[PDB]
C-alpha cells in the first residue's frame with residue numbers, strides 16, 4: 001500500500017546563488033537576481049534582461065571534456081542533482097542502485113545547443129553538426145547523464161510540461177516511491193532558454209516584461225504595473241525517499257511530501273482562466289490527496305509569474321479554495337526575486353517551500369508597491385515574514401492548461 | 413490492490429498508413445514505408461531516405477488556422493489521439509471529464525518549427541519569429557491541445573524519454589489508472605524528425621543507415637549487413653481505460669495492459685551494454701509487475717533498431733531473461749518496415765503488439781537475409797507467422813540508457 005515520502009536532499013542553481021544556502025539568503029533578504037543579459041547582443045530584442053546564473057563553474061562538477069558536449073540546461077541539471085545527492089548523504093551500492101531513479105525535467109531543454117547546431121546547418125551544412133548535438137541537447141539526458149555518473153538503475157525519465165515541469169517531476173517521482181516502483185528518486189528540473197530563439201520566441205508572443213531600464217523591478221507579481229514574466233535560468237533537485245528507508249539510514253529529513261495534484265484546465269493553449277478554476281481544481285486534488293483540512297495551509301508559494309491574467313487567476317483560485325482562511329495563510333511569489341525559471345520554476349520553488357517550513361518564514365513578494373484590484377490577501381509585500389508554517393503548498397501552471405500542486409508539512 | 417487497465421481505442425500515423433488498419437495491413441504484408449525524402453535538398457547529407465507520413469491531411473482534424481500554429485509532431489499526435497478516442501466510442505461528460513487525462517510525448521519535439529524560426533532569426537532577425545513558436549513547439553501541447561479540444565481535466569502531462577517516450581507514456585498512464593488517479597488516459601507519442609536537423613543530428617553521430625541505393629533494405633535488424641537505424645515520422649495513441657468503466661459502457665476491448673517495466677542502464681549516453689543487462693532488468697521488472705513467469709511470453713516486438721550494438725544487446729537480454737524459453741517465443745522488429753519513429757516507436761509498436769494478440773500473428777522482421785553471430789532466435793524473418801499469442805511484450809531502449817517494457821495479455 002501507499003508509502004510516505006520525505007525530502008532528504010536539495011540542490012540548486014538560481015539567479016540568486018550557485019547553491020541552496022546562498023539562493024535562500026537572497027530570498028530572505030529580498031534581493032533580485034535580474035540584470036541585463038551579458039552573454040549575447042540583444043539590441044534587436046524588446047527584452048534585454050533576465051535571471052542569469054552568474055559565475056557558474058561546471059568544472060566544480062564535470063571535466064571540461066564532458067561539459068563541452070552538454071547544453072547549459074544539462075550542466076545546470078547535473079549540478080543541482082549532484083548537490084541534492086551529496087546533501088542527502090545517500091550511498092549508492094549494488095544493494096540499492098536498482099531502487100534509485102531520476103526524473104529531472106525541462107520546458108524547452110537544449111535551446112542554445114539546438115540554435116547553434118541549426119546555425120551550423122544553415123551557414124555551413126550538415127557536415128558541421130556536432131555528433132554530440134542529440135545526446136547533448138534532448139530533455140531526458142539530465143536523467144540519463146545523472147544515472148550514468150552515479151549508477152542509478154531505478155526508473156529513469158523526464159517530464160516536459162512547460163512552466164509546470166518541476167512540480168510534476170517532483171509529484172510523479174513521489175508517486176513512484178509511494179507505490180513502490182522506487183525507494184529514492186532525484187527529481188526537479190532545469191532550464192536555460194536565454195538564447196535568440198528563447199527571448200525572441202517569448203518576445204514574439206509579447207509574454208515578457210519590457211522593463212529594460214529597471215530589470216530588478218520588472219517582476220512585480222500582483223502589482224498593477226506588471227507587464228509580463230522575466231525569463232530566468234537554473235535548476236532545482238530534491239532527493240525524495242520512502243520514510244522507513246530514510247529512518248533506517250538515519251537521514252536528516254527536511255519535510256514530508258503529503259500531497260500532489262495535477263489537473264488540466266482544458267481552457268486555453270496559453271491563457272489561464274480568470275476565475276482560477278484549474279488552479280482551484282488542482283489545489284483541491286492535492287489537499288484531498290494530503291488528507292488535510294484546507295485551514296491547515298499556512299503558506300503558499302504562488303506560481304506568481306507577473307502576468308496580468310496569471311496573477312489575478314491565482315488570487316481567485318486561493319479565495320475559492322480557502323474561503324475566509326484565504327485571509328489567514330501567507331502567499332508570496334519568489335519569482336519577484338528569481339524571475340521565471342520555466343520548467344525549473346516548480347523545482348526551485350518546492351525547495352523554497354521546504355525551507356519556509358525549516359526556518360518558519362514566508363518569503364516576500366518584492367516590488368508589490370500597488371497591489372492590483374482584488375489582490376487583498378497577505379502577499380508578504382516587500383519583507384520576509386517570520387510565522388508559523390506547518391503546511392506549505394507550491395503551485396505551478398503552464399501552457400496547455402497544465403496545473404500542479406505540491407503539499408509539504410513539517411515532519412516529527 | 414490495484415485496478416486493471418484495458419485498451420479500448422487506438423490511433424496511428426506511420427510510414428505505412430494514415431490509420432491503424434492501413435498501417436497493420438502493411439505490417440502483415442511485409443511492406444516497407446521507407447523512401448527518399450521529398451520536397452527537401454538532402455544533397456549534402458549522408459542519408460537521403462526515411463519513413464515519411466504520406467498524404468496526411470491535418471484539416472480532417474483541425475482548422476487550417478489552428479494547424480498553422482502547431483509543429484507537424486503536434487499535428488501527428490492530435491491525429492492519432494483523435495482517432496484513438498473516436499475508435500474507443502468514449503463520451504466525455506460533466507460527470508467523467510475530471511477522470512479523463514492525457515500523456516502524449518515526444519523524444520525530439522519540434523525540429524521543423526526550430527528550422528523555420530531559425531531561418532527567420534538568422535536571415536531577418538527576431539522580429540520574424542512566429543508568436544506561436546513556443547506554444548506551437550513545446551512537447552506537452554499534444555496533451556494540452558487534446559485536453560482543451562475535448563474538455564479533459566484529468567492528469568495532463570507529457571514524457572520525453574528519447575526513443576523510450578511512447579512506451580513510458582503508455583506505461584505511466586496505465587499506472588495513473590491502476591492507482592485510481594484517472595479512469596481513462598490517452599497515451600502514446602509523436603515525432604517528426606525526418607528533416608534537416610534530424611537527418612543531420614543523427615547522421616553526425618553516424619547513427620543512421622547510409623544505404624541510399626536501396627532505402628527499403630536499409631532497416632535490417634539482426635542482419636549482418638545492418639549499418640544503423642532509419643529515421644521515421646508519425647504517431648501512436650491508445651485509449652487506456654479501467655476495466656469496470658470499459659465493461660459498464662459496453663466498450664470493445666482489444667487487450668489488457670498487465671505489466672510495465674522501467675530500468676536505467678546507467679551505462680553510456682547512446683550505447684547499450686553488450687549483455688543487454690538494462691533491457692533484461694526492465695523486462696524482468698515488467699513480468700514481475702504482471703505476475704507472469706517468462707515462459708508465458710509468446711511474442712516480443714523488439715526495439716530492433718538495425719544498429720550493430722542495439723540488435724545484439726537485445727538478443728543477449730532475451731536469452732538472459734527467457735533461458736530455455738528464448739527460442740519458443742517469436743521476436744520481430746516492425747522497424748524493419750516502419751523505421752524508427754523515435755519517441756513514437758513505442759506507441760505504434762504497443763498497437764502492433766495489441767493487434768498481434770487480436771489476430772494471432774507475429775509480424776515479420778523483413779530484410780533478415782543473413783542473421784548475424786548469435787542471432788539464432790525465432791526472429792520471424794521475411795514473412796508474418798500465424799501462431800498462439802496470449803502474452804505480448806513491447807520493448808523500447810533510448811539514449812541515457814532509459815528502458816521501457818509493456819506486457820499485454822489477451823482479454824476474454
Ligand SMILES: COC(=O)N1CCN(c2ccc(F)cc2)CC1
Nearest residue numbers: 108109138520521522546549550
Ligand atoms: C533536438 O531538439 C529537441 O530536443 N527539442 C526540440 C524543440 N523543443 C522546444 C520546446 C519548447 C520550445 F518553446 C521550443 C522548442 C524541445 C527540445
